[PDB]
Ligand binder design. Structure first.
Ligand SMILES: CCCCCCCCCCCCCCCCCC(=O)OC[C@H](COP(=O)([O-])OCC(O)COP(=O)([O-])OC[C@@H](COC(=O)CCCCCCCCCCCCCCCCC)OC(=O)CCCCCCCCCCCCCCCCC)OC(=O)CCCCCCCCCCCCCCCCC
Lengths: 36, 69
């Protein structure tokens, strides 16, 4: 029943990576640098 | 919070549309203004009888000035 050790470890690693990617999809306070 | 929106590039379609509009208008605004000026100042001809012994030219059988020219 449940995950295997490798399954859980890989889900944890993929989770950390995915959350970093989603965090870095955010815009900085200046991003839409519109030209005049 | 403001996220980044992943879209395909819209630069090239937009540039194409601007270029097409530009060239179409570049030559078609003068034509519209010219047709208006002709219609207002020149106008169409009025139907009249063929005077005695007179023979009209082939273009004098049409009423619109642009068609006549
Ligand atoms: C676009 C960019 C992206 C690309 C898109 C794709 C584009 C591709 C385009 C490809 C190129 C195409 C080229 C084709 C060229 C064709 C030209 C042509 O065939 O001309 C025909 C025709 C030419 O006329 P004509 O037959 O030679 O003249 C006959 C008469 O002798 C004339 O009569 P007249 O001399 O007595 O009239 C006076 C004169 C002028 O009239 C006036 O000055 C007065 C008008 C009345 C005004 C009265 C009120 C105003 C004043 C009031 C306020 C001031 C006074 C009061 C002030 C004090 C108040 C107290 O009339 C005109 O000049 C009309 C204007 C003509 C313009 C023609 C333009 C053609 C352009 C060709 C190139 C295309 C370029 C496209 C871009 C161009 C820019 C748009 O022009 C028209 O057809 C105009 C159409 C008018 C339609 C009227 C409305 C009818 C609507 C009914 C149907 C809709 C009902 C609802 C439908 C369903 C809805 C649900």
């Amino acid at each position: 029943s449940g995950y295997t050790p490798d399954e859980k470890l890989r889900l944890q690693q993929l989770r950390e990576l995915r959350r970093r990617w989603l965090k870095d999809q955010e815009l900085s306070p200046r991003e839409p640098v519109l030209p005049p | 919070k403001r996220l980044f929106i992943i879209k395909p590039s819209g630069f090239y379609d937009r540039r194409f549309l601007k270029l097409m509009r530009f060239y179409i208008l570049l030559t078609g605004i003068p034509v519209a203004i010219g047709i208006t000026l002709v219609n207002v100042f020149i106008g169409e001809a009025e139907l009249a009888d063929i005077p005695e012994g007179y023979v009209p030219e082939h273009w004098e059988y049409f009423k619109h000035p642009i068609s006549r020219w």
